[PDB]
Design a protein around this ligand. Structure first.
Ligand SMILES: N#Cc1cc2c(cn1)[nH]c1ncc(-c3ccccc3O)cc12
Length: 258
């Protein structure tokens, strides 16, 4: 079939929406003028999960790299979060379930995302959540051997406190922490602090258990109890994903089917 390899770029997504000339299939094409991306492509080639943005392949033409990726027509989770309100608890729990599934998957293959936030969590036409953008992602386990991380990266309001305090740290608790900040945002429509430092008053308040303040006062006791287990300063004491899956709120029936 002639023309089947031709794509019309029709709209900027943040990354272009590309539509196939013949089939009308929509994909996202990430255009990166190399005048970093080799690692992103390498990691993307490893990924196959329903809650991770699918990678279809790539083509380079001179200096511009083109990554062909899963198109998520529901846009960013960020835009489902109403400022100062958040979203309905059942929607937040469903999104949180899907986020955990994606992160369990990545961690199982030894990959850490390192920049989980609502801007990077995309939604398909059925509002299924997809983890996107592996530009900051890295290998933390290879040949069944863990490598400790030392590079400071991510996004300050979402970063775990150990990344600011310690020279080296385990990868998995950092992604757990960012998922907790995402959950807070979904349930309160606000981020709890600028960054998790002892200099940050809102972070000190949390450590002193002042949950009569915002954002915490807006969050029901059940999800709040989970957040108390996730947003724990010591990453060794922090809840792991297998234990998140046993959490009372995590397992609370809330949401009807589509
Ligand atoms: N990096 C990155 C990246 C980014 C995307 C993607 C794959 N990778 N698929 C998408 N589908 C929709 C969107 C999108 C559409 C509308 C509004 C905001 C968006 O981020 C972004 C991506």
């Amino acid at each position: 079939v002639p023309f089947v390899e031709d794509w019309d770029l029709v709209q900027t997504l943040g990354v272009q929406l590309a539509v196939n000339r013949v089939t009308e299939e929509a994909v996202a094409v990430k255009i990166v003028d190399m005048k970093n991306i080799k690692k992103e492509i390498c990691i993307n080639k490893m990924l196959n999960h329903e809650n991770v943005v699918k990678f279809y392949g790539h083509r380079r033409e001179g200096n511009i790299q083109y990554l062909f990726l899963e198109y998520c027509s529901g846009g960013e989770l960020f835009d489902r979060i109403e400022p100062d309100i958040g979203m309905p608890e059942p929607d937040a729990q469903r999104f949180f379930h899907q986020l955990m599934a994606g992160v369990v998957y990545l961690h199982g293959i030894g990959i850490t995302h390192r920049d989980i936030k609502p801007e990077n969590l995309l939604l398909d036409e059925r509002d299924n959540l997809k983890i996107s953008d592996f530009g900051l992602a890295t290998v933390f386990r290879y040949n069944n051997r863990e490598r400790l991380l030392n590079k400071m990266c991510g996004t300050l309001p979402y970063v775990a406190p150990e990344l600011l305090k310690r020279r080296e740290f385990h990868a998995e608790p950092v992604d757990v922490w960012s998922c907790g900040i995402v959950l807070t945002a979904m349930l309160a429509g606000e981020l709890p602090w600028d960054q998790p430092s002892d200099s940050c008053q809102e972070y000190s308040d949390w450590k002193e258990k002042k949950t009569y303040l915002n954002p915490w006062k807006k969050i029901d006791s059940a999800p709040l109890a989970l957040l108390h287990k996730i947003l724990v300063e010591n990453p060794s004491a922090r809840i792991t994903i297998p234990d998140i899956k046993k959490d009372r709120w995590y397992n609370k029936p809330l949401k009807k089917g589509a």
